[PDB]
Structure formats: structure tokens, C-alpha cells
Amino acid sequence: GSNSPQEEVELKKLKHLEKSVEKIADQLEELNKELTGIQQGFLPKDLQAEALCKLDRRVKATIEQFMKILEEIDTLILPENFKDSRLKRKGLVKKVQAFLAECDTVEQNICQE
Amino acid sequence: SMSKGPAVGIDLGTTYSCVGVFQHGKVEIIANDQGNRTTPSYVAFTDTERLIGDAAKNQVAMNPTNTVFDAKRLIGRRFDDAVVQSDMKHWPFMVVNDAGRPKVQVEYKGETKSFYPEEVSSMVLTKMKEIAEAYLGKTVTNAVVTVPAYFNDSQRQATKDAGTIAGLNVLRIINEPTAAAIAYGLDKKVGAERNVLIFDLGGGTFDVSILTIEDGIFEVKSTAGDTHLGGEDFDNRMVNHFIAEFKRKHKKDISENKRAVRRLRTACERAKRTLSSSTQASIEIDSLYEGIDFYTSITRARFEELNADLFRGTLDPVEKALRDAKLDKSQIHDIVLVGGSTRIPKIQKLLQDFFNGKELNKSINPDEAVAYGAAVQAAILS
């Protein structure tokens, strides 16, 4: 290939963003396990509604952290020759959007009336 | 514990506040704990804590009904004031009537709490005092606090009271256009009386002030402006342009997807800043809407065309202020730029052409000029 030293700078930025995404994804993973735990658990019904609505603050914080990541990714300008960077950027945005769709699922299952 | 520090200058702004200190023969504008030279005039109430500044603005999307901002639009006003009634239709937080006085109503640690506007502003002032102390490594008590020239007695008193509640010894309340003229040493220029036009264009407010400086005395001759015109309106025009472009290119309407619009708005605001020092800005947003990548660009000329009526309209309050001050544009000795939106080259060009090529006072960071002049005043009164 014609791999340039300049692309290494963009790839490093994207790696830092991937690490930041992984930290937020671990918070989402704990929300999913607790949500599954309440839905399939042995709590009485009135306590179940309360336990589910207690996840609201954390799910909203998780959504916001993912949105901030997308805004930081959106500051990148990658020339068409920087193919690896573009593929990495595309993969990272799709991964964040799939995580946001899981956050939306959590929101659909809590604080319902 | 800490040694006693110097007196500071605080620009207590509608959306952002700024603190400066005069040290080693110059003004240092103080960065907050996040490295920002301006601090959002935001206060948030959560199930567990009270957040001020950047930490409050950062969680506004997560807790909108308990995140207070714009307390300056309420401070010293009666509940039935036309401004209070008009503004409360747009705020996500509640404003209640307490015996004719407005109060912000919020949920705080699971309890319904109400606060007067001066209590909210006292919390922003407490943060500005702490920002100064974190930088200086000394306790800060003395401060000059600024207010708009059009603030009446009640609005001035309520600002002084916010300073008192914040534990500040308010050395003086001075007008924002006066502070900007002080920052440029306009009072120290030799000769007769000087007529000064202050052109203050922020993110959400436009204020024109005409001052006369005679023998070191500042007299406000007139005030004009547009209370809700600012940088945000220019961002709106750019967003509308790009939503229309996505419809033409992809036959898809992104406008009901809040996250796609927010991503686009954030990129627009950033591209607009780029356009003040470059003639073109590029935007690349992967998977903006229904998996479609949005790769585009905007020239400075296109940005100017999209906002032509708004930029041109900034001269109408200038003419109104001149009319009210009973002065001809040729009698203006100094023009001062305040507010981040004054960085727009077309705005500078229109104002300079109106004043027949006269140079503008713009070397001081327009977001910091008011705090700068306040810090100069604070040092003089020390």
C-alpha cells in the first residue's frame, strides 16, 4: 500500500475513541444485565416498577455519553485515500448507533405507564 | 489555609460568565476546572447533588426540567413583567409566582424546591469565585460585577444581592459597555469627549450601546438591540440549508430525528467558527440518517448569503441608538466589538463600511472584553 505517517495520527485518535466507547459499553452491559435481572427475577410487581424506573438516570447518562462520542467522531475529516481510517470511523459510528438502539430498548422497558 | 488574594472582575452573563484578574501589569482571564475561559451560567439539581457551570450544562439533555439557565433574564424582575411571561414559554424548567416575584421551581434530592433568581445567580457567582481561587491559590472576596446598561434599580440591586449571598464583597456594579470601553483604555485617550459605540453580539443577545466619555465620566446616551438575536440564529440557517440539501440529495427528511439534527447542529456551529478564519468548511458525518453518510462543505460566501437579512439587520439598532443619542455616525470616535458572533468577517465588514472604513476595537477576545474591563476596575478599586 501507500500508508502514510499522517494516517497513523487519525488511526490513533479513532483508537482512543474506541477505548472511550468500550468504557460506556461496559456501563450499558451492566444496565442490560440488571434490566434482564428485574424482568426475569423474583421481585413483587410494585417493587418491579420501582426497580425498573431506578435505571432511568443511568440509561440517560449512557445515551448522552454515546452522543458526545458521535460529536467528537464528527470532527474528523478523512481524505478518500485514508481508507483504513474511513473503515474504522464507519465501523465505530455503527457500533455506537447499535449501542444507542440498545439504550432506547432499555428506555422502552422502564418508567412505563 | 490560603493567603488573601487580589480583587477580580466578573462578567455575569446570560448564557456564560467570565472571571479576570489584573496581575503583573496585565489582565489574566481565568480558565475553569475544565480549562474553559467562560463558564455556562447553569445550575442543575439532581437526585443527589447540585451542579454548576460546565457540569450543569453537560447534563442538560439528561435532566432538562431541573437545569436552570437564563436566571439573568429573570433577576430583579416582577413575575408579571412582559419579559418573564414571554421567556417562560420557552424554558423547560418551571417559573412560579411568589407574592409578585418569580421563583424557579425544581426537584432537588427528591424534594420540590424554589429559588429566587438572585439565589441561582449567587450559585454561578460562587463558582466564578472558586474558579479564581483554584487558579490563584489564594482566597478571593473582592469583585467588580457587571450588568447590562438597560438594567433598572431592582435588576441592579438583585445582582448586588446575588454577589452578597455568594460571599463576595462587591466593590462596584459597572455597566457591560462601560467595562468594554475600560478594557480598551478609551477613557485614557487624550482630547475632548469621546462617543463610543459598543456592538455586543453573542449567542442569543444583541445589544448596541452608545456612551459619551468626558473627563473620565461615562454617560450612557442610548441602548438598542434585539433580545433574542445571536449566533444560534445563524446556526439555525445553516441547519435549514443542510436539511434541505439532504432532502435534495437523498429524498429523506432527517428533521424528526432529534439525534441526527443535533449531530448536524453541532457540526454547523463548529463549521461557522471555521468560516471566520477560512473561506470554506468541510463536514463529514457518518451514518447521519438511515445509515447515509453525509459528506459536504459550505463556503463563507454561502454562509453569508444564508444569513444576509440577519447580518444586515444588525445595523438597524445601530441607527436607532445613533438617533436616540442625537448623534451622526461621523461623531462616533470608537467602535468596540463584544460577543463571540462579532468574529464574523461579514458583520465586521458591514459595521466598518457603515462607519466609512473606521478601524474597529477588536484585539481583545470579544467573549472576554467585559470581564477584562471589570478586572481593570477591580484593580483600580483595590
Ligand SMILES: Nc1ncnc2c1ncn2[C@@H]1O[C@H](CO)[C@@H](O)[C@H]1O
Ligand atoms: N469564530 C467564531 N465565529 C463565529 N461565531 C463565533 C465564533 N466564536 C464564537 N462564536 C459564537 O458566539 C456565540 C457565543 O459563544 C455562539 O453563538 C458561538 O457560535
